Design an enzyme around this catalytic site. Structure first.
Site, short mmCIF file in Angstrom:
data_model
loop_
_atom_site.label_atom_id
_atom_site.label_comp_id
_atom_site.label_asym_id
_atom_site.label_seq_id
_atom_site.Cartn_x
_atom_site.Cartn_y
_atom_site.Cartn_z
CB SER A 169 -0.99 0.02 1.17
OG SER A 169 -0.33 0.01 2.43
CG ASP B 38 -3.81 5.00 7.92
OD1 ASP B 38 -2.58 4.97 8.14
OD2 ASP B 38 -4.34 4.31 7.02
CG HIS C 57 -1.57 3.62 4.68
ND1 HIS C 57 -2.69 3.12 5.32
CD2 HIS C 57 -1.09 2.61 3.93
CE1 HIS C 57 -2.88 1.87 4.95
NE2 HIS C 57 -1.93 1.53 4.10
#
EC number: 3.1.1.112
Lengths: 238, 240
Positions: free
Chosen positions: A12, A187, A190
């Protein structure tokens, strides 16, 4: 008109690297991928291969497929561990397998004459992460800075053994001291724009040190500057 | 792991499309290229081929060299005119040649089964531009909204003839920018983040209309969602 390619391979944090709007505040933030494409414009293509939630085990399965199809990759980042280092659950990958998986990726890249760069996990804002991911925490799937440090240390060792650069994001994220590091995350896991900027600047530093011919400042800017083009365009490519 | 390619072909406005920091305030702005890569992640690669200061004549020389190499380009923007429409000087390309050059690009793209999208010039903040480019202006090298409009209209006509979409940025800039239209530009010619956001949204609209299979909402997100991957990874490539 064949450009060399710089592959960004990971999870990610690689998949999300071009988003200037990671939060719904409308406001734009720095994006690693955007900066890379910009500075390497008319120099090198940026090839993005990030897969949200993926581990070193799953990434190892997909890497040969990428390298078979793509031509002229000369350099690549490997950035996995933010998932593997989870303490339990389906994303957990134990340290010896993790290191061997990354080693196999480095070896495969070297077999294509690709210059590898290993990226270590950044920090986790555990207080924030565990609020938003309470369901995972209930199952015992912790992401801790202690474990991320264990994985980062093992990646530093592997990097030295394979003679490739290592970007220690966990140390780089601590650079201002105090609580400043919390702003480097969206968050709690990330990266924010500020996080991506540190990632970018540290990445470019190891590129200058190890692979200077592929640093933006040393690469040939392709095709004639417009001011030097002949009226008929006969000299554009030579 | 075969990705299709979306080619962005053009001049400085294409070259500069990924820069979030076009000015020295240190404040990040929206970037067309960044949005495109993000929304097409695990769907389509974005292939940037912009050349600062280039015209349709010079771009026509480059195009066949790009297309002969690059595999799997399925769609492409063509964005030239911000230089060609200059009123005089080394960057000026007359309208008949300009249109013929763009037409040749469209017809070459089609022979490669590439879906072309034609982009028209945006607005020029002439007051600002001419303050920076005084030496060029003194030589008589003007960039005017009137001349840009003639080139835009001709591109719309060509696009209709060739049955490809046209993005009319000059009109879109007027409608969305209103009296604040000057903030859609940085130096008066090149685009700010706000200009690039209009360009983006208009681009995606014509893609949905003309080439829906290559709009992000309709494209397959490649590889299994991580939550659906089996422990050993045996199903990662299953639907590919």
């Amino acid at each position: 008109m064949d450009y060399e390619k710089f592959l960004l391979f990971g999870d990610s944090i690689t998949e999300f690297a071009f988003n200037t709007r990671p939060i719904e505040d409308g406001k734009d933030q720095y994006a690693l991928g955007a900066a890379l494409v910009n500075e390497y414009t008319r120099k090198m293509d940026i090839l993005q291969r990030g897969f949200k939630g993926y581990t070193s085990r799953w990434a190892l399965k997909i890497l040969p497929e990428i390298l078979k199809h793509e031509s002229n990759i000369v350099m690549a980042t490997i950035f996995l561990g933010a998932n593997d280092a989870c303490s339990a659950g389906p994303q957990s990958v134990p340290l010896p397998e993790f290191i061997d998986n990354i080693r196999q990726m480095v070896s495969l890249m070297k077999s294509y004459h690709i210059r590898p760069i290993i990226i270590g996990p950044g920090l986790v804002d555990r207080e924030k992460w565990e609020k938003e991911k309470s369901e995972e925490i209930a199952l015992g799937y912790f992401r801790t800075n202690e474990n991320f440090a264990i994985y980062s240390d093992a990646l530093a060792k592997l990097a030295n053994e394979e003679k490739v650069p290592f970007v220690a994001l966990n140390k780089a994220f601590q650079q201002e001291g105090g609580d400043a590091w919390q702003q480097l995350l969206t968050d709690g896991l990330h990266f924010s724009g500020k996080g991506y900027k540190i990632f970018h600047d540290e990445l470019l530093k190891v590129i200058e040190t190890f692979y200077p011919q592929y640093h933006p400042k040393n690469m040939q800017y392709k095709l004639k500057d417009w001011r030097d083009v002949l009226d008929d365009g006969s000299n554009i490519m030579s």
